[PDB]
Amino acid sequence: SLTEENAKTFLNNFNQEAEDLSYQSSLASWNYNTNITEENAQKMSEAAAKWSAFYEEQSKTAQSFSLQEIQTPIIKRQLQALQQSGSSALSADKNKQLNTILNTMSTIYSTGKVCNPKNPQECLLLEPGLDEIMATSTDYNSRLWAWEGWRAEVGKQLRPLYEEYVVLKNEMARANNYNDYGDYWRGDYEAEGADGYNYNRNQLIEDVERTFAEIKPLYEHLHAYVRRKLMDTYPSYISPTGCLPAHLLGDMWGRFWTNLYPLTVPFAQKPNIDVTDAMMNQGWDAERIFQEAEKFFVSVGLPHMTQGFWANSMLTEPADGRKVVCHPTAWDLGHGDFRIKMCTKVTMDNFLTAHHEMGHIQYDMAYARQPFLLRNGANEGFHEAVGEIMSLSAATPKHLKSIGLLPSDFQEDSETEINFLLKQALTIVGTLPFTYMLEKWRWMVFRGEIPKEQWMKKWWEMKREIVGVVEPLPHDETYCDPASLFHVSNDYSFIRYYTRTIYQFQFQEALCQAAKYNGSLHKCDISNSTEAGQKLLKMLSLGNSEPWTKALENVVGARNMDVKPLLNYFQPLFDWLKEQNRNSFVGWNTEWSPYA
Amino acid sequence: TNLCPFDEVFNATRFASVYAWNRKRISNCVADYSVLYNFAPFFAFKCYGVSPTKLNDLCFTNVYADSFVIRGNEVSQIAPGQTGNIADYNYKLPDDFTGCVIAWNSNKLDSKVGGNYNYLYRLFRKSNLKPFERDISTEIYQAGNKPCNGVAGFNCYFPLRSYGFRPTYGVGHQPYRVVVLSFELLHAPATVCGP
Ligand SMILES: *[C@@H]1O[C@H](CO)[C@@H](O)[C@H](O)[C@H]1NC(C)=O
Ligand SMILES: *[C@@H]1O[C@H](CO)[C@@H](O)[C@H](O)[C@H]1NC(C)=O
Ligand SMILES: *[C@@H]1O[C@H](CO)[C@@H](O)[C@H](O)[C@H]1NC(C)=O
Ligand SMILES: [Zn+2]
């Protein structure tokens, strides 16, 4: 009861100053992303330097508070959040060396180029370069040369850098009273609670391994089906029982299998729901799209959007002497300022992205009453989950017909449901094994289990165990394959995408059950149902003031992550796949290899 | 007929900060409160024990007008019995109140692109304020035990802080102008009456 009052006063002062010092930085960043000019870059840099210096000084000052003396949980949470700023609690020279390594990694990834084995006139890059040539083409050699060349350049030029990066990051992590840098990443999910509710940061490895065990039976069947359909486009290249070659997955790395849709359509005679023509005929613009999104959100009890949102936000390409960034983003600036930056157009994809971004802003507005240090998401992947559950119940035929973009006498087709489910499956299910494998590999390398001299020897060995892909040509230890990903050479964690997928389906089942709907889950819609809105706003207004095991309990009525709802979502596709795979063989043998 | 000077109270080029709140004594004039409804939609107009639309039927010895500028969310702290920052360290109303408050938006006049730093408020004080009491002191607050000899630093902070208004803020953070009218009837005839 002696330092608790001091902590309260210190937190009050910090909250008063931080909002003012952060609004300027956010506003400068916004002014640069909507203008792009030499002066604006300097303004952004000088705005960010002040905030960084102030935050570092405040964290160093706040380090002098013994946590055991405090009783009140909220102040302890705020102080624990403020103290954890050991991203540069090292020596100066080591910090400069690490910054130089990171900068050279980023530059060498961005500026890398690949030249054709034949005439060197082409010498393409990644950009709209290699990405298109191996996202559209259906020729073996055309994909193979690019896939081999990109690795034989980037990995060769990146291996020593990553070798030094591992040890520097481990030193950084151990200086912060951790075990390794992988534990530093895993510490995001750690939470402390009163009545149980504790989530030790060592259990995640057990949890991620458990849930994946229940997704293997479904994925396996999908991995069979696609394989069959790949035996027609490339006849004499894929064994009936084995692993798919890496360079034939419709993407540079195999993160997504969406681009395999044209060759894997089960019913080509029935086209998907395309609504752009109706929008053009009816005379729609961007403003109408966003008013429709706002109406859908207010139909479930959530509040409207402020007049500042309409006044300030950029919603169309300015078509003036101004260059902008057209990556869609949702901005919260503090002091009640919310905006969207989107170069939106008249298409279904923009229509769904509007709902996604508007859900981001709804969550931000919901947690706007908490103190400043707790105005974040409840976890690393709650934001996206909340964003995607809104767009999930917006492309359903019921909602589209309910607003007039589809004929009123429309008849649902049983053959179309399978196509929609298959596209969703190739988008969603096909990415979980890749993320799990990559994160396990980085965790093992950081922990020191994998020797420095066997990295690739493990990377591929367990690649043809979980995801089920075989390399086209052998790679020596001089290679560094995983450095080619943007989420590896430039830091960033990679486990948020595994948690987001499961969270979104749990939330969707909870809300659609709370809205009293009977039938298939993928057809459920939450519009014009006030009951689901209050249940969602119950979690959305907490921020991270309470452990993430409590908001999940509030909404879905559980205390961990379960994959049963995901299995309910894809049940008809599971039955159809099982029916059509009853003659062929499921599973793969880890012995076949395209080389000798 | 000599009307009361309300026109010069609700109209002013520049108002006063919340901690240094102004107070005007109105006495010996005929008061027509019906001209108080000559502004934009009032955000707050609620009267405690005076029965509005009957202001023209009472007589009081003198009236006090107190004017200041505060944030949007703080307007609820200008009621009797409330607790917060403004109601504890800047401006507090007694439990037995007789009169009422008028609060309206002033975003078009008190907001600038770079920030308006001419409005200040108190954040730290040793003990709460008695009703109708003004503090203007600028002594550095001492929260810890070690004195810092009047220089800012750890465990001693500057009590006054600025609002910093901008036109792009949300409604709850835009500036609001508040005028409080306090009536009192005493054993000294009565000079403030109706038409
Ligand atoms: C964009 O930059 C120009 C030149 O610096 C500036 O005059 C303008 O105010 C900026 N903002 C706009 C055009 O919204
Ligand atoms: C359902 O919600 C939509 C929101 O766009 C609204 O237009 C409609 O009137 C509501 N009711 C029905 C029966 O569609
Ligand atoms: C205040 O000034 C405006 C403009 O000069 C005027 O219209 C109004 O009558 C004045 N008085 C009040 C009470 O608004
Ligand atoms: Zn998003």
Author numbering:
A (entry chain A): 19 to 614
B (entry chain B): 333 to 527
Text lifted from the article:
Previous studies showed that the SARS-CoV-2 PT could not infect mice, whereas omicron BA.1 can achieve close-contact transmission in mice and result in severe lung lesions and inflammatory responses, suggesting Omicron has the potential for transmission from mouse to human. Compared with hACE2, H34 is replaced by Q34 in ghACE2, mACE2 and RatACE2. K31 is a very conserved residue among hACE2, ghACE2 and RatACE2, but it was substituted by N31 in mACE2 and formed two H-bonds with BA. When R493 of BA.2 was substituted by Q493, these H-bonds were gone, resulting in a decrease in their binding affinity. Notably, BA.2-R493Q mutant has a significantly decreased binding affinity towards mACE2 or golden hamster, and slightly impairs the binding capacities of BA.2 to ratACE2. In our results, three-RBD-up conformation was observed to bind the hACE2 or mACE2 receptor.
The trimeric spike (S) protein is the major glycoprotein on the SARS-CoV-2 envelope and is responsible for engaging the ACE2 receptor for viral entry, and thus, it is a prime target for vaccine design and therapeutic antibody development. Receptor-binding domain (RBD) in the S protein plays an essential role in ACE2 receptor recognition, and mutations in the RBD affecting receptor binding and viral infection have been reported. To unravel the underlying molecular mechanism of the S proteins of Omicron BA.2, BA.2.12.1, BA.2.75, and BA.4/5 bound to hACE2, we determined their atomic structures of the S (BA.2, BA.2.12.1 or BA.4/5) or RBD (BA.2.75) in complex with hACE2 by cryo-EM or X-ray crystallography. According to our previous reports, the binding interface between RBD and ACE2 could be divided into two patches (patch 1 and patch 2).
